[model samples]
Target: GSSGSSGKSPVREPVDNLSPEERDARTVFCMQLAARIRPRDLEDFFSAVGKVRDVRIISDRNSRRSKGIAYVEFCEIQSVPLAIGLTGQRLLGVPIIVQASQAEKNRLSGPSSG
Candidate 1:
């Protein structure tokens, strides 16, 4: 039926609920940031909490602009609590979202050798 429901944006999946099927894809910490922040800046800010293993700011394919989201990996799991505590803190007037990664496919990265 072409008569679809009223146009509306689909709700994004929550990042805190990782299904049992996705246990293998678990990440200690990850965040969906909202703002035009770069990886370097993210590192500088997040590093205050712990050793930042990597910072990846997702971008659009064509426009190549910050899609207001990013992923952060910590060098140690113990550092997650510090980062979590900093959630809702403002950076450049934007209160970014931060949460542990619960991806179903381990799409973020593989285990660290260090």
Candidate 2:
């Protein structure tokens, strides 16, 4: 016989349970940013590719210093590839790196390469 509070575990919704549009049209990861680069700066730079939703710069909680990495969100999914093409572009004298977000990769259902 099972006792009260038996071995039942809580179930959570899948993390990838996003709208089809949002699955591809979300954010991109960025790196090689200078310490002086701010969220607004990233938004302005990436805006050339598409309409930017927001920019988030990673920072250390202790030192409060920029981690030289960021994530840029676009208003449309088509902007992601365009943004990735700007990987080698220079921002504030630093060649920034851009790539698809991990979540985006997971959302891919087919082979994206030859």
Candidate 3:
């Protein structure tokens, strides 16, 4: 049998790369994506789905290299559902998982601790 790290799900929750207001807003979401993907690549892949307000590829503080995850902000809440529909699809041959950020949920439900 073949078993290794490639099959494992994300070990930690994605980091929020948006501003305070953006993080808690309904239109922003996060994803666990492949490492080495550039911001423009991300935008090119997602812009076809909806109006992307912003796309950030998180990076290490020291190395400044991609962290293999990102946060995407859309122009409006309506754009989210449309983008969410692309979950499980591939970009550059890598599977991408999309979901609403915990902060987004918390804002809708109620404020919560970090």
Candidate 4:
């Protein structure tokens, strides 16, 4: 009798050279952030879904306080959906909102005309 343990290891590469358009596709918009949250906070939180490429937290120019909004970019586009799934999850005692940063230009259904 022969016994062997086989495990599959998935290989992943960092997408460092992604174009602006492509990067936007892999980014997720986050809201309801705490006033003290920083880019590193977001990066650590969202890293649960996948490898985070970058994280940007919107802040006031002068006060430098969080504006309760941010953008998280993952190494792969596949991480977008996984990040979105974290919507309503709490961070810093606030339930943050997560959604795709991609703009919806095309609507499948149009308004009915008279």
The better-scoring model by TM-score among 1 and 3 is: 3
Q: Which prediction has more favorable TM-score, 1 or 4?
A: 4
Tens-digit lDDT track for model 1 on 1-114?
232232211233356553443332223343445455677777778889777666656565445553455667776555666777777878657766666654323345455320
Per-residue lDDT of model 2, residues 17-100, tens digit only: 555444334778998887687887788888898887778777754345544777888876577888898989988888898988
Q: Which whole-number lDDT from 0 to 100 does residue 73 have in model 1? A: 70
For all candidates in order, the CA lDDT equals 0.56, 0.71, 0.61, 0.70
Q: Tell me the spans in candidate 3 whose CA falls farther than 4 Å from its real position.
A: 1-23, 61-67, 102-114
- CA deviation > 4 Å runs, candidate 1: 1-35, 61-67, 103-114
Tens-digit lDDT track for model 3 on 1-114? 342332222333356453445333545455657666777776667787776666766565435553355778776556677777778878777877676665455567635332
- Clash pairs, model 3 backbone: none
Q: What is the number of residue pairs that collide in model 2?
A: 1
TM-score of decoy 2:
0.64
Q: Please provide, for model 4 over 1-114, each residue's C-alpha lDDT reduced to its tens digit, 9 standing for 90 to 100.
A: 343443321244354564434545677888888867778777888889888877877775544653477788888778888888898888888888888776331133244310
Local lDDT at 15 for model 4: 45
Please give the range of 10 consecutive residues that has the lowest summed lDDT in model 3: 3-12
Residue ranges of candidate 2 with Cα displaced over 4 Å = 1-25, 61-67, 103-114
lDDT for 1 in candidate 1 is 20
